[PDB]
Enzyme design. Structure first.
Site, PDB file in Angstrom:
ATOM      1  N   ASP A   2      63.136  31.252  17.729  1.00 44.94           N
ATOM      2  CA  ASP A   2      62.173  30.176  17.469  1.00 44.94           C
ATOM      3  C   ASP A   2      60.811  30.736  16.532  1.00 44.94           C
ATOM      4  O   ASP A   2      59.944  30.185  16.538  1.00 44.94           O
ATOM      5  CB  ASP A   2      61.574  29.486  18.559  1.00 44.94           C
ATOM      6  N   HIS A  26      67.099  24.793  15.479  1.00 51.66           N
ATOM      7  CA  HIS A  26      66.454  25.063  14.186  1.00 51.66           C
ATOM      8  C   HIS A  26      65.954  23.729  13.900  1.00 51.66           C
ATOM      9  O   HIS A  26      66.563  22.763  13.482  1.00 51.66           O
ATOM     10  CB  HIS A  26      67.455  25.550  13.288  1.00 51.66           C
TER      11      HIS A  26
HETATM   12  O1  LIG Z   1      64.471  26.381  24.934  1.00 52.67           O
HETATM   13  C1  LIG Z   1      65.199  26.024  23.987  1.00 52.67           C
HETATM   14  O2  LIG Z   1      65.075  24.934  23.610  1.00 52.67           O
HETATM   15  C2  LIG Z   1      65.904  27.243  23.326  1.00 52.67           C
HETATM   16  C3  LIG Z   1      66.199  27.056  21.946  1.00 52.67           C
HETATM   17  N1  LIG Z   1      67.043  27.889  21.229  1.00 52.67           N
HETATM   18  C4  LIG Z   1      66.657  29.323  21.719  1.00 52.67           C
HETATM   19  N2  LIG Z   1      65.358  29.476  21.513  1.00 52.67           N
HETATM   20  C5  LIG Z   1      64.942  30.618  22.197  1.00 52.67           C
HETATM   21  N3  LIG Z   1      65.602  31.396  22.883  1.00 52.67           N
HETATM   22  C6  LIG Z   1      67.100  31.110  23.116  1.00 52.67           C
HETATM   23  C7  LIG Z   1      67.518  30.063  22.521  1.00 52.67           C
HETATM   24  N4  LIG Z   1      68.751  29.692  22.873  1.00 52.67           N
HETATM   25  C8  LIG Z   1      68.945  30.732  23.884  1.00 52.67           C
HETATM   26  N5  LIG Z   1      67.747  31.591  24.140  1.00 52.67           N
HETATM   27  C9  LIG Z   1      67.558  32.561  24.861  1.00 52.67           C
HETATM   28  O3  LIG Z   1      68.989  32.997  25.217  1.00 52.67           O
HETATM   29  C10 LIG Z   1      68.864  33.896  26.773  1.00 52.67           C
HETATM   30  C11 LIG Z   1      70.246  33.358  27.450  1.00 52.67           C
HETATM   31  O4  LIG Z   1      70.392  31.711  27.227  1.00 52.67           O
HETATM   32  P1  LIG Z   1      71.754  31.120  26.641  1.00 52.67           P
HETATM   33  O5  LIG Z   1      71.733  31.636  25.044  1.00 52.67           O
HETATM   34  O6  LIG Z   1      71.552  29.730  26.967  1.00 52.67           O
HETATM   35  O7  LIG Z   1      73.169  31.746  27.190  1.00 52.67           O
HETATM   36  C12 LIG Z   1      67.741  32.704  27.405  1.00 52.67           C
HETATM   37  O8  LIG Z   1      66.711  33.676  27.666  1.00 52.67           O
HETATM   38  C13 LIG Z   1      67.259  31.710  26.468  1.00 52.67           C
HETATM   39  O9  LIG Z   1      65.920  31.071  26.174  1.00 52.67           O
HETATM   40  C14 LIG Z   1      65.068  26.646  20.923  1.00 52.67           C
HETATM   41  O10 LIG Z   1      64.917  26.271  19.806  1.00 52.67           O
HETATM   42  O11 LIG Z   1      63.955  26.935  21.729  1.00 52.67           O
HETATM   43  N1  LIG Z   2      52.387  25.294  11.997  1.00 47.53           N
HETATM   44  C1  LIG Z   2      53.570  25.986  11.756  1.00 47.53           C
HETATM   45  N2  LIG Z   2      54.523  25.446  12.187  1.00 47.53           N
HETATM   46  C2  LIG Z   2      55.941  26.401  11.799  1.00 47.53           C
HETATM   47  C3  LIG Z   2      55.767  27.117  10.873  1.00 47.53           C
HETATM   48  N3  LIG Z   2      57.081  27.779  10.581  1.00 47.53           N
HETATM   49  C4  LIG Z   2      57.841  27.114  11.826  1.00 47.53           C
HETATM   50  N4  LIG Z   2      57.156  26.273  12.119  1.00 47.53           N
HETATM   51  C5  LIG Z   2      57.699  25.225  13.583  1.00 47.53           C
HETATM   52  O1  LIG Z   2      57.656  26.173  14.642  1.00 47.53           O
HETATM   53  C6  LIG Z   2      58.861  25.764  15.337  1.00 47.53           C
HETATM   54  C7  LIG Z   2      59.878  27.053  15.545  1.00 47.53           C
HETATM   55  O2  LIG Z   2      60.885  26.565  16.219  1.00 47.53           O
HETATM   56  P1  LIG Z   2      62.403  26.725  15.744  1.00 47.53           P
HETATM   57  O3  LIG Z   2      62.709  25.639  15.073  1.00 47.53           O
HETATM   58  O4  LIG Z   2      63.217  26.838  17.132  1.00 47.53           O
HETATM   59  O5  LIG Z   2      62.716  28.024  15.050  1.00 47.53           O
HETATM   60  P2  LIG Z   2      64.202  28.934  14.748  1.00 47.53           P
HETATM   61  O6  LIG Z   2      64.624  28.645  16.007  1.00 47.53           O
HETATM   62  O7  LIG Z   2      63.975  30.178  14.469  1.00 47.53           O
HETATM   63  O8  LIG Z   2      64.653  27.946  13.452  1.00 47.53           O
HETATM   64  C8  LIG Z   2      59.391  24.563  14.364  1.00 47.53           C
HETATM   65  O9  LIG Z   2      58.869  23.534  15.252  1.00 47.53           O
HETATM   66  C9  LIG Z   2      58.911  24.726  13.001  1.00 47.53           C
HETATM   67  O10 LIG Z   2      58.550  23.419  12.534  1.00 47.53           O
HETATM   68  C10 LIG Z   2      54.568  27.556  10.163  1.00 47.53           C
HETATM   69  O11 LIG Z   2      54.475  28.376   9.304  1.00 47.53           O
HETATM   70  N5  LIG Z   2      53.514  26.684  10.713  1.00 47.53           N
HETATM   71 MG   LIG Z   3      64.979  27.577  18.044  1.00 53.80          MG
END
Ligand SMILES: O=C(O)C[C@H](Nc1ncnc2c1ncn2[C@@H]1O[C@H](COP(=O)(O)O)[C@@H](O)[C@H]1O)C(=O)O
Ligand SMILES: Nc1nc2c(ncn2[C@@H]2O[C@H](COP(=O)(O)OP(=O)(O)O)[C@@H](O)[C@H]2O)c(=O)[nH]1
Ligand SMILES: [Mg+2]
Ligand SMILES: O=C(O)C[C@H](Nc1ncnc2c1ncn2[C@@H]1O[C@H](COP(=O)(O)O)[C@@H](O)[C@H]1O)C(=O)O
Ligand SMILES: Nc1nc2c(ncn2[C@@H]2O[C@H](COP(=O)(O)OP(=O)(O)O)[C@@H](O)[C@H]2O)c(=O)[nH]1
Ligand SMILES: [Mg+2]
Lengths: 430, 430
Positions: free
Chosen positions: A16, A44
């Site tokens: 994220d 994403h």
């Molecule tokens: O909460 C969400 O919506 C998660 C989503 N995608 C991810 N972002 C951040 N961490 C993530 C993602 N996918 C997997 N994990 C982490 O991987 C760990 C194992 O979970 P999994 O992949 O489901 O087996 C576990 O610790 C997860 O938190 C997002 O964009 O935020």
């Molecule tokens: N304010 C702000 N928000 C951002 C910036 N870059 C990304 N974001 C937001 O931060 C969040 C990151 O979550 P995520 O989309 O899961 O990131 P990814 O999983 O790495 O693609 C999204 O809602 C983006 O739109 C930034 O430079 N400024």
């Molecule tokens: Mg994400």
């Protein structure tokens, strides 16, 4: 000669970081935008002209109607979720995507019961240790585990003799009910949908190896690779076992798309200006307080897949430098700098101490990591609105120092600074 | 700057191509010789000065007392087998190896019951389909499956709080007995050995990421990477599901040692002059006949791990070219050319036809592969003893044509020609 070299965008922390944003920006003139590992557990966020999108399985370049989106063999696909996603984005204006979406016939399949076992395994680990992984419950772990075991099924299997497939489907279904007797699986029901998806996916399926290879050796093309998850979530290098079940690091690009290391060009690491972690596990700079609330809030830090509130903390250089040793980043994308606009002071973790003494390297043992004392450095805030910045000159003094600080301490250069969610909210530094 | 680039030796078919031989030859002046994926299911034969060795977990460079042997995080280790192997080679003269053997603290552990479940899964698949995978029964599949599931345990876990480890060991043991109620596991017994191995392994363990990274960026070093298994046995790209459970292809080097693609220099593909496959699965050029017997016999083609007789067939270019698309070989090592010394004619598979029509690329679906009709090319034998050859000039005309034929049809150059088992039985062509 050897062919074109692809550009890779990887997460440097625990996800994220803004991968969707960086990939969207780079995919404008991309011929092919691909996804190599993970599944729809990934989330994403892309923002362009008001419209906001959240991709999970669809490469973030699926927006570019001129570019081709590709899902590699390393990806694990849950068919239902795949279309659930495409249709949701159709409503947002996505049209004729099935026209520019190619799916590697070697990619494994996430079955309904996988996501089910995923949930059950989480409830079991919790109701047996008071602590579970924090899985997104998208069946990622169970599917990758079936894959390594060679019991899993793939795209080409679904598109082949269905009777054959069905016989395997049933054997796999049983294998799971065996370890989880309280699992309900409508064998004939789930198979009816899978047969329907088969004909829905058919036209998009292709041989991934031949596909990527042909693209990298034909007339020069610009290929972009969208990483999922991140370095510290990597099955091998992350905070095991509190990680995801695929290789999110740079090697995952090779094993997930079938391309040799020499066809790997720029590898960009997406670095969030502060650290976030969604799920269970060690987190040295975590801030359970007012400052933690201000980051979570100003940063709208909640799951783009689950909706869970993410934990927030100061930037942590120990994990970043560690991530660099494994991925070999060529330039960084420092995102969400604006979130820090209000702070009068910004702390950053520079090293980890244990029993008073500083530890030599990032720990393989996660439990150790849970006991380290973070050594911080305090920097002055810029206390100004950077959301309108568009060039190096715009950023005030402290903001620029913060960007250098990340640069110097990592030995890697910052090529982009994020100041907003939208495509335009970027500052290319070179 | 970015650091040194390692040299990689990979299998281009279904293993046993002569990787131990090529690695031994290249490790003479190597500073570090490492192993990145697989376990002791691998069997590498080295021959130097009469003495013959068969390594399984020990990098084939463990012979060089001047070089450092390294076992990366991608490797799965069965502790008992590890020492069983080292002691067997001690008797052959290996001394003070524990002095130059480093073990990545992130490498997973193969437990006694893993090898047990491995056997049980094989008997179950056979006694339920009349056909199983053909596993070496070294527990490789079960351990990699536990790894993806995040239930597995690693070196650092064994070396840490033993009580903690034991609690996990037991949970994992149970998890297996659950899917295999007929599995007997002496929980307390196996744990006694594991505690003993812990202190035996301790001194050799190190942080692999930091280790490789330090080596690639400190004063220039020559690092060699020994692949295991081969391209067509790759979990993603091989003849799934009749493959091994790790990435044997070039990407496996990155995910298995934690090094970025830019630190990957030469990638050599070991190509046997004819094709062999030990285990179950499609094999287009397989020769179940007199010619098949002559290759198996003149080539002493039997498991260096199991003792099983390997299936033999003519060289097959479809798999070789496929392997090249995934690994991006920079030069080849054509081994066991001498085996062909007697033949008056040597056939080679150039393409696969189906229903009369030629197929465009290597099939992702293994069942298809079982029905393709191989299109052969017949070349003239040289009918001469090449075992004494040492330079390009020595090889007779037909032998040289055969070497070119492999070159031309693969677009990759042959840098070494194997004419014997010993180190000296090589011909460097450039
Ligand atoms: O909460 C969400 O919506 C998660 C989503 N995608 C991810 N972002 C951040 N961490 C993530 C993602 N996918 C997997 N994990 C982490 O991987 C760990 C194992 O979970 P999994 O992949 O489901 O087996 C576990 O610790 C997860 O938190 C997002 O964009 O935020
Ligand atoms: N304010 C702000 N928000 C951002 C910036 N870059 C990304 N974001 C937001 O931060 C969040 C990151 O979550 P995520 O989309 O899961 O990131 P990814 O999983 O790495 O693609 C999204 O809602 C983006 O739109 C930034 O430079 N400024
Ligand atoms: Mg994400
Ligand atoms: O027979 C032996 O002694 C094998 C030994 N090492 C290997 N050589 C050739 N093929 C091998 C090896 N290891 C795994 N495999 C093949 O991988 C398939 C899955 O088996 P496994 O890796 O045990 O899970 C399965 O088809 C295996 O045959 C050798 O040097 O010959
Ligand atoms: N006659 C002959 N035998 C060879 C040659 N190269 C390798 N071998 C033998 O062929 C066998 C190959 O099996 P194996 O050691 O499993 O190969 P690896 O798994 O790729 O290291 C070994 O017994 C080698 O000594 C060669 O050029 N000629
Ligand atoms: Mg072998």
């Amino acid at each position: 000669a050897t062919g074109s070299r692809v550009t890779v965008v990887l997460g440097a922390q625990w996800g994220d970081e803004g991968k969707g944003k960086v990939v969207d920006l780079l995919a404008t003139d991309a011929d092919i935008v691909s996804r190599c590992q993970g599944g729809n557990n990934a989330g994403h966020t892309v923002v362009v002209d008001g419209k906001e999108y959240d991709f999970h399985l669809l490469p973030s370049g699926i927006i570019n109607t001129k570019a081709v989106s590709f899902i590699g063999n390393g990806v694990v696909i849950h068919l239902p979720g795949l279309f659930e996603e495409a249709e949701k984005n159709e409503k947002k204006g996505l049209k004729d995507w099935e026209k520019r979406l190619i799916i590697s016939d070697r990619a494994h399949l996430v079955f309904d019961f996988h996501q089910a076992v995923d949930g059950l395994q989480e409830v079991q680990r919790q109701a047996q240790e008071g602590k579970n992984i924090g899985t997104t419950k998208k069946g990622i772990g169970p599917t990758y585990s079936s894959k390594a075991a060679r019991t899993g099924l793939r795209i080409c299997d679904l598109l082949s003799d269905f009777d054959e497939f069905s016989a395997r489907f049933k054997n796999l279904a049983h294998q799971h009910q065996s370890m989880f007797p309280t699992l309900e699986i409508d064998v004939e029901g789930q198979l009816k949908r899978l047969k329907g998806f088969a004909e829905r996916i058919r036209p998009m399926v292709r041989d991934g190896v031949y596909f990527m290879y042909e693209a990298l050796h034909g007339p020069p093309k610009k290929v972009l690779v969208e990483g999922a998850n991140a370095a510290l979530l990597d099955i091998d290098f992350g905070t095991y076992p509190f990680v995801t079940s695929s290789n999110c690091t740079v090697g995952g690009v090779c094993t997930g798309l079938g391309i040799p290391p020499q066809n790997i060009g720029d590898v960009y690491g997406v670095v969030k200006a502060y650290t976030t972690r969604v799920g269970i596990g060690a987190f040295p700079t975590e801030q359970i307080n007012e400052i933690g609330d201000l980051l979570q809030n100003r940063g709208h830090e909640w799951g783009v897949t689950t909706g869970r509130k993410r934990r927030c903390g100061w930037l942590d250089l120990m994990i970043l430098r560690y991530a660099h040793m494994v991925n070999g980043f060529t330039a960084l994308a420092l995102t969400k700098l604006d979130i820090l606009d209000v702070l009068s002071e910004i702390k950053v973790g520079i090293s980890y101490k244990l029993n008073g003494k500083r530890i030599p390297y990032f720990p393989a043992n996660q439990e150790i990591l849970q006991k380290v004392e973070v050594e911080y450095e305090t920097l002055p805030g810029w206390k100004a609105d950077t959301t309108g910045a568009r060039k190096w000159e715009d950023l005030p003094p402290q903001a620029q120092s913060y960007v250098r600080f990340v640069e110097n301490h990592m030995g890697v250069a910052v090529k982009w600074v994020g100041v907003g969610k939208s495509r335009e909210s970027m500052i290319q530094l070179f």
